[PDB]
Structures are given as structure tokens and as C-alpha cells.
Ligand binder design. Structure first.
Ligand code: A1B5M
Ligand code: ZN
Length: 140
């Protein structure tokens, strides 16, 4: 589990969104595993506006923050699971690292702020859904 709190927005994995999230929906994209909903209180996270390929992520299955190298956001094939059929997930970045399904929501961050959240894993790799192109998150 886990979310990014920026201004009056809550950014979560779409496969983990609750009722309140869908009711107060701002934007969602199944092909990115992302969902943004409105909030009443202000969040304090800052989104990274950069092309960094190194950072640190939180792994709840290990209670540890790992420094990683990650690939640029791409269209990656993601096997079928209990949440989606086999499909291509867009804006996805991979790193060599440990993850389990319950790790989704863990923040990936660089010196500039939040880069994205854990979304995929398996085969000794961890996938993060990029949020750095979502410029509207800093305004309105
Ligand atoms: C973070 N993590 C997720 C997994 N397992 S997964 O890659 O099958 N994953 C299951 C939950 C939905 C994910 C998606 N975005 O399609 C795929 C392992 N580690
Ligand atoms: Zn950066």
C-alpha cells in the first residue's frame, strides 16, 4: 500500500483505489495502473520534474529503502494477475530489486522529489509507474 499526497490530490495504484477515490475521481488510466482523486487537506509531497535514472525506493516486504538504477518510462508487457489480464503497461520503469504485490504504493524518489510508485514485480525486477509527466499535479 501507499500514496503520493500533492496539493489537493491523492495518487494511488488504480488496482488499489477505494470508494472515496472513485467518487472524487480526478483522473485515471488503467494502462498506467494510476488513479488520482481529490482531497480536502493539503499534501506535502513534491513531484520530481527531471530525467533522473537513479533514486531510492521503499520496500515494505523488507522494511528497507534501496538505492536503485532504473530505466526510462516505457511500454512494458505485464503478465496476467488477479487485477488485470495480460497487457502492455505504459510509462513503466524497471530496476533490479525485490518486490511483492503488497509493495505497490512504495515511493521511488530522487534528489528532486517523487518520481513514481511501485506497480509491478517478478523475475528479480521491480516496476515503478512514472508520475513526472503529470504536470497538472503541481497546479489547480
Ligand atoms: C510490486 N509487485 C507487484 C508484483 N506482482 S505483479 O507484477 O504481477 N503485479 C500484480 C498487481 C498488479 C500489477 C500491475 N500493475 O499490473 C502487476 C510483484 N511485485
Ligand atoms: Zn530527479
Amino acid at each position: 500500500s501507499g500514496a503520493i499526497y500533492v496539493g489537493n490530490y491523492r495518487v494511488v495504484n488504480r488496482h488499489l483505489a477505494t470508494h472515496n477515490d472513485w467518487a472524487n475521481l480526478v483522473w485515471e488510466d488503467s494502462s498506467r495502473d494510476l488513479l488520482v482523486s481529490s482531497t480536502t487537506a493539503q499534501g506535502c509531497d513534491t513531484i520530481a520534474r527531471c530525467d533522473c535514472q537513479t533514486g531510492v525506493y521503499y520496500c515494505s516486504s523488507r522494511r528497507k529503502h534501496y538505492p536503485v538504477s532504473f530505466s526510462k518510462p516505457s511500454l512494458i508487457f505485464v503478465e496476467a494477475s488477479e487485477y488485470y489480464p495480460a497487457r502492455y503497461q505504459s510509462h513503466l520503469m524497471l530496476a533490479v530489486g525485490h518486490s511483492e504485490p503488497g509493495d505497490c504504493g512504495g515511493i521511488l524518489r530522487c534528489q528532486h522529489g517523487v518520481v513514481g510508485i511501485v506497480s509491478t514485480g517478478g523475475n528479480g525486477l521491480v516496476g515503478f509507474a512514472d508520475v513526472r509527466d503529470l504536470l497538472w499535479l503541481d497546479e489547480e
